[PDB]
Amino acid sequence: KRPDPMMIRWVNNKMGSVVAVPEELLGTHAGVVFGAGP
Amino acid sequence: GACKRVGRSDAYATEFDLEAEEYVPIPKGEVHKKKEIVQDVTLHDLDVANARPQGGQDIISMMGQL
Amino acid sequence: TNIESAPSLAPMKHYCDVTGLPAPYLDPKTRLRYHNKEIFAMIRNLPQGMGEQFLEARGAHTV
Amino acid sequence: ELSYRQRAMYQSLRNQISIMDTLMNLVMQFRKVCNHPDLFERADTSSPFFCGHFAETGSFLREGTNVALGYSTRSLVEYRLPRLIWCDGGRLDKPGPGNLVAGFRSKYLNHMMNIWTPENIRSSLEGIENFTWLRFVDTSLQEAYRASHTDVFARAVDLASKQNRLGHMQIVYDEPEDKKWTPVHALFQICERENPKAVAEITTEGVLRDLMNIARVKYRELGLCRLEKAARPRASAPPIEVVCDSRSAVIERENIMFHPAMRKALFGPTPSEIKEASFGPRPVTLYPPRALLPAPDHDKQRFTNITVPSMARFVTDSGKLAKLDELLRELKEGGHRVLLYFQMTRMIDLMEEYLTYRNYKY
Numbered sequence: 001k002r003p004d005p006m007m008i009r010w011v012n013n014k015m016g017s018v019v020a021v022p023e024e025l026l027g028t029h030a031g032v033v034f035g036a037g038p
Numbered sequence: 039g040a041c042k043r044v045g046r047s048d049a050y051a052t053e054f055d056l057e058a059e060e061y062v063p064i065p066k067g068e069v070h071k072k073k074e075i076v077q078d079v080t081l082h083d084l085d086v087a088n089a090r091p092q093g094g095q096d097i098i099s100m101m102g103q104l
Numbered sequence: 105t106n107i108e109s110a111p112s113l114a115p116m117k118h119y120c121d122v123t124g125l126p127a128p129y130l131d132p133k134t135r136l137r138y139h140n141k142e143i144f145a146m147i148r149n150l151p152q153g154m155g156e157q158f159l160e161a162r163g164a165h166t167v
Numbered sequence: 168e169l170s171y172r173q174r175a176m177y178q179s180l181r182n183q184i185s186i187m188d189t190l191m192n193l194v195m196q197f198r199k200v201c202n203h204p205d206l207f208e209r210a211d212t213s214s215p216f217f218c219g220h221f222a223e224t225g226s227f228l229r230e231g232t233n234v235a236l237g238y239s240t241r242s243l244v245e246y247r248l249p250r251l252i253w254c255d256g257g258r259l260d261k262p263g264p265g266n267l268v269a270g271f272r273s274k275y276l277n278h279m280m281n282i283w284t285p286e287n288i289r290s291s292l293e294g295i296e297n298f299t300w301l302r303f304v305d306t307s308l309q310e311a312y313r314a315s316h317t318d319v320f321a322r323a324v325d326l327a328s329k330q331n332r333l334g335h336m337q338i339v340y341d342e343p344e345d346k347k348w349t350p351v352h353a354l355f356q357i358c359e360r361e362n363p364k365a366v367a368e369i370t371t372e373g374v375l376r377d378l379m380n381i382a383r384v385k386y387r388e389l390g391l392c393r394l395e396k397a398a399r400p401r402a403s404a405p406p407i408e409v410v411c412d413s414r415s416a417v418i419e420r421e422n423i424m425f426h427p428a429m430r431k432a433l434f435g436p437t438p439s440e441i442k443e444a445s446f447g448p449r450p451v452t453l454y455p456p457r458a459l460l461p462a463p464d465h466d467k468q469r470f471t472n473i474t475v476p477s478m479a480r481f482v483t484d485s486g487k488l489a490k491l492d493e494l495l496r497e498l499k500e501g502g503h504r505v506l507l508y509f510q511m512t513r514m515i516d517l518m519e520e521y522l523t524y525r526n527y528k529y
Contacts, residue, residue, distance in 0.1 A: 005446075006442075006445050025446075027448075028446055028447065029449050029450045030445060039274065040262035040269065041262075042262060045414070046414075049115075051115075052116065052118055053115045060414040075271065077272070077275075087277060087281065091316055091318050092276075093260035095277070095317070095318060098319060099318070100423065
């Protein structure tokens with residue numbers, strides 16, 4: 001299943017944590033924090 | 039800057055056979071009128087208007103109480 | 105050019121097909137427009153062919 | 168013995184023994200209620216008496232699978248007013264023909280001769296003049312003007328957008344070198360710049376943080392947010408309405424009683440607005456920007472007086488069923504699955520509902 005266009009996902013475990021960003025939000029303002037703005 | 043919808047013009051009264059609408063004749067005088075009205079207020083009216091939002095400025099007044 | 109007019113976009117007023125007076129009502133059975141109950145009474149007991157003549161006076165027809 | 172629900176109905180119907188005879192018909196319904204009161208009257212989701220008009224559905228068979236649910240609810244109390252009063256200038260604030268005062272008076276009392284308009288304020292902004300302080304209150308002439316013309320609800324919506332930046336300064340500009348710095352245009356907001364509430368939220372030992380939440384914690388710890396409601400209003404009604412035979416009244420009813428801006432503020436941003444804001448190339452501040460409707464204090468009853476019958480209530484509503492529940496749990500631990508025989512066939516259905524609640528097996 002392809003992930004939701006606008007739910008950014010945080011996951012934390014023994015390895016620490018990560019944030020994963022939908023391909024639809026890269027190139028939006030919400031991508032700017034991740035180095036992937038417009 | 040005051041304006042009012044007087045109604046719907048009765049030239050459209052048969053736009054439908056029933057609508058929830060109020061149909062009024064076209065105005066039959068001049069479209070423009072100029073008249074001079076000597077308005078009176080009082081210093082208390084200025085108090086009240088400046089003390090609090092009045093009329094349609096304060097709709098939440100419909101709650102009463104506070 | 106001999107091609108020279110078009111229909112109005114305004115809504116037309118409604119007149120009684122019998123007496124020409126204004127008509128609030130359209131009869132769903134015969135589709136004649138009528139002024140009042142007195143004219144509705146004559147419309148619903150017209151001689152059988154007459155209904156199409158009141159329509160035809162305004163160029164309307166059943167077919 | 169009988170549960171109080173059984174006991175009440177049984178007593179009311181056995182009282183008919185004094186009135187009539189029919190004895191067989193009565194003693195049949197004795198046996199009914201003494202088995203379970205839901206055989207006699209089913210407990211079902213219920214609400215206060217509605218003292219109002221609504222549109223009834225006249226037929227189910229004619230209704231079809233797609234139906235439009237209009238909000239039909241209206242008051243039976245019904246205030247007939249002529250349009251001469253309600254629309255044609257008997258309301259003094261409503262400008263139009265006839266009401267020639269209202270249009271002048273609105274402009275002059277709210278703008279021209281109104282002290283809060285920026286041009287008037289700007290003439291009073293120095294020395295001993297009445298707006299001298301406005302340099303040191305953090306509002307601009309525009310915000311002061313707005314706050315003097317908008318009502319308490321609209322002003323509270325505007326507060327929802329703002330950042331308590333003076334509270335953050337209390338965390339940062341601490342030290343003697345910081346001189347407890349404050350922006351000079353906020354100089355008079357002393358109690359915002361110096362307030363324990365900000366510090367108590369940042370310290371890791373939450374001692375004063377907890378001391379400030381005592382009331383809300385214990386309220387919740389007492390379970391009062393979850394305990395069943397012990398009362399509700401016996402009647403409920405919608406607001407009384409003006410009834411006026413004009414279209415302006417119908418528009419103005421919708422503008423006030425179903426006020427779009429208040430409703431939008433309470434219920435928050437619309438889903439397409441959330442989509443536009445999240446997919447936009449640059450950030451945009453939504454309105455309002457959040458749902459300003461509070462959380463309900465009762466975490467289960469929320470904002471309505473509708474009750475749903477509990478299965479625990481159903482169990483205890485029959486004295487036999489309440490007594491049988493202990494016996495069936497004993498019999499379960501005795502190794503027996505449920506096996507019972509009934510004089511009334513409909514009681515088997517209630518036991519199937521009971522067993523599908525309990526998840527015990529036949």
